[model samples]
Target: QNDGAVEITSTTFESNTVAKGISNNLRIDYKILNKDKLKDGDKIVISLPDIFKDIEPKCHDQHFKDFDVKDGVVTLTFNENVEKAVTGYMIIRFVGNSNIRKGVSYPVSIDLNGKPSTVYITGEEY
Candidate 1:
């Protein structure tokens, strides 16, 4: 069925800093479950909050029929049907807004297949 749900196992920032409004990388580990598997044409979408200005994403394993990033949102469409649970990671390059103040944690919002998670990114002096 195409009812599979994407469960985020972990989220991390490669640099863990957005100092001086610089760019950073993020990684998300996810698994497909709550259904037997996903079918062709099934889509997985990841949404990033407004704090992030731009996105460059890569979905691991290259199983997607198409992958795209637009206005901070990522969409991946599977090319083939999978009979088992699928595990994958997504790597994203992102930059924060320059207007963000330093020395505080900002809530970074991530939504995977409509499931939301919050992660904190601390701002640093430029």
Candidate 2:
């Protein structure tokens, strides 16, 4: 069952709930269970919101093979290494400060092993 094969466990913001300026970034924690993986052929893609006008991202330990940035979404890809990863995390920084208020949250969606799971990032939200 795909029930919980894909899950988002955490979204950590360096300064606020959601990513703010370049200094404060957002970190997303995700995982695939039940033998599902983020390896070749299989994939894990994250779509960032429009508020992120420009993008900078880090997945150091979990190296993604390819990435593409379109107008509405930012996508990431993985190789065999990330396939077996227990949990994967990504840190993203936007080029400039976001207009989103401190308490506002944004939606970040992921496609894991061809399945869909959605997670929200919170900032000041006020």
Candidate 3:
């Protein structure tokens, strides 16, 4: 097994339950294990579970440049290299465009630059 250099400090949802055909914000707290190796254009990609519908990713830290998502994967690209350790949070706001089936549990699986984390949520009937 290969250990990753990126660390996912914590992952949480804004709400305990989302209405059927709705969405919630998933926040990710993270740290870069190899901060010294980071450079311009270096990116951190997050792979999300299939429960999400349409995802929009955002990072507020100044070091991050680009925020994008594709095929359930969110990417954060660095604008410049950093001398200090990189620890920050990002958000993935996914809307249930196709609708998650009502009355069931769907676990969220997230991969942050090779590190993995999970969160649980359920769909509520409206």
Candidate 4:
């Protein structure tokens, strides 16, 4: 999924019911759910889970910061002193991967870490 452009609420994958052998590959078919509930001004703030420290250091250091939607453009902010040049796309990739899941409805405030934050989506049409 492309970051900042698409926010998926739910997805489903379909594959063969039985596995033939090591060469067998599962075909995936997915549908993006909750499209009607999403709006132009909706927001999505991603963050790392608390238990992921041992896996990656960048996930722990990065913050949710802030985001603003204007004229259909979303601009994200980072905490002061964040050196984007050094971090590169680590935070973005981390957040993007963490948010992807199938057959689950994630609440707005809860991050992958299970920690709650003020960041959330707005302009939802129910």
Candidate 5:
């Protein structure tokens, strides 16, 4: 499965439980395996989980589009043309509450140039 494409470094979730709500900062970082295979028009996308509400991103650079949600699935896209910094990270701030109870979990999807792909790993450091 080594197509020599892009590679995900780590995805982490930093959350804090409060009296009435739970706030989280999900960071998705990655490295482009090969730059020649990627182009300026290509992009990287992140799918927000179901529990995400009033989601927002805190960052310094990179060309990113506003978060878009449809049918309970949310996503944010970054244009590859932004910079050639093959490695980077995105911090998405998601807000939640205790209404869902414990052991709640969700999936995060990653897409490259509109093509869905599998994540290499998720960090336990969360």
Candidate 6:
């Protein structure tokens, strides 16, 4: 399935936890196609996940903190005071900077410390 190209997959989870009352979890998976095809200044595409309700897309950035990429996995943290009562779920998406290429496979990691609730994501990351 390389098709002489790389693909990246990512997932985000939204649920209710004790710490934030409601939190989000992000998971990412990816693979390189044609090692030589890899290059610097590539663009990474991050799509928004479903499960968040009553919130506007534009409000996503405001809800979750920026991501920190290490190795091939990206980590994102949420700000304090994030409660499930406030918002049913948190939606998220990623846009690779100049460092990564678009459609490349990458792993995502999200931490949720709080109550326990169901998690959901929108769209597909493959």
| TM-score for each candidate, following the candidate numbering | 0.67, 0.57, 0.71, 0.19, 0.60, 0.29
Q: Taking the tens digit of each residue's C-alpha lDDT, what string does model 4 give over 1-126?
A: 322322223212122111112111111111222334323433333432221111211222332245543432223333333323221222221112223333333322322122223322211111
Candidate 5's displacement at residue 107, Å, is: 3.4
lDDT of 3 by residue, 44-118 (tens): 666655666668887865657688878877878765554556778888887754456566677776654455556
lDDT of each: 0.67, 0.59, 0.68, 0.26, 0.53, 0.32
Query: What TM-score quantifies how close candidate 5 is to the native fold?
Result: 0.60
Model 3 TM: 0.71
Which sections of candidate 3 miss by over 4 Å? 1-5, 20-23, 39-44, 49-54, 78-80
What CA RMSD would candidate 2 show?
Answer: 4.5
Better of 2 and 5 by TM-score: 5
Per-residue alpha-carbon lDDT of candidate 2 for residues 19-124, written as tens digits (9 for 90 to 100): 4444456676766553344336555566766556557667744556666667656566654454453666787766334566665667777665556766666554
lDDT of 4 at 105: 32
After superposing candidate 4 on the true structure, give the runs of residues whose Cα lies further than 4 Å from its correct spot: 1-64, 81-85, 90-126
What ranges in model 6 sit over 4 Å off? 1-3, 9-21, 47-126
lDDT of 1 by residue, 1-126 (tens): 123455678889986667545788888776776334555556656666556676777775544568788776677765454445677777788877865667677766666545566777777776
lDDT of 5 by residue, 27-61 (tens): 76766566566554445566644444556766435
Candidate 6 lDDT score at position 48: 29
Model 6 lDDT, full chain set = 0.32
